[PDB]
Amino acid sequence: EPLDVVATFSIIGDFAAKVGGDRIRLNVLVGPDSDTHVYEPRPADAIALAGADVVLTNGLEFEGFLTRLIAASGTDAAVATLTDGVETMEEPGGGGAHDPHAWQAVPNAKVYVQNIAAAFCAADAEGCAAYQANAARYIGELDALDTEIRAAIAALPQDRRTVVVAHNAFRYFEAAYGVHFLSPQGVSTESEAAAADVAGLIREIRARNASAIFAENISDTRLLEQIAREAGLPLAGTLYSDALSGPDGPASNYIAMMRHNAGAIAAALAAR
Ligand SMILES: [Zn+2]
Q: Per the CB 3.0–4.6 Å rule, which of 99, 138, 208, 213 could disulfide with 164?
């Protein structure tokens, strides 16, 4: 009777719970504090897909395992790519690959949400008015959030807008909001460290007068702690990049995740 939905990872799982309410049964593959770039699907994940009516995915090559997992599971679920209709950004490096981290700009989260609603509308026409009224309610909360983030940032001094994080995961926040981010890893956490290039990072840190270093919830902290040491900059806290916190963390849903991040960034930038 309820719609069987599978979401690839936590951030889009939260969006699904918002649009779908009581009418869906939700399963999430990659969970809180876990990293989708390196996730290897387990056999339990194939069982989940096999029963789904709807599978929700970021797309943009975020989930390198999906298409395999789809064929292994034999699922007939319809698959919705929630970045459909988002203004995407190309990866810096490559490779006409796209940067998958589109949810870091709240306007794009509105789109993910619209696509969830459409997907549920296609699978359960009887529920469609309810899916859309949930989406519209939530989209109103996202619009207020967007306003608050832009406002807080645009206030801050033009000359102190840079922070250091773990991977290159906030380019859409930069584009929406005007905060510049450096990191030792690229767009994906698949690679390494090339501690052979912290001295490169550090030099860019000095040239840009970066205000602070942040850990990320998906990643181990040691290099960040060391970069902090060598740059003489505080380790200011933890940002939530590609996953929610668990419950009882400060980022257990998307809106809370963004308010945390934006508040932590602003405090650090204003510290100087
Ligand atoms: Zn990432």
A: 213
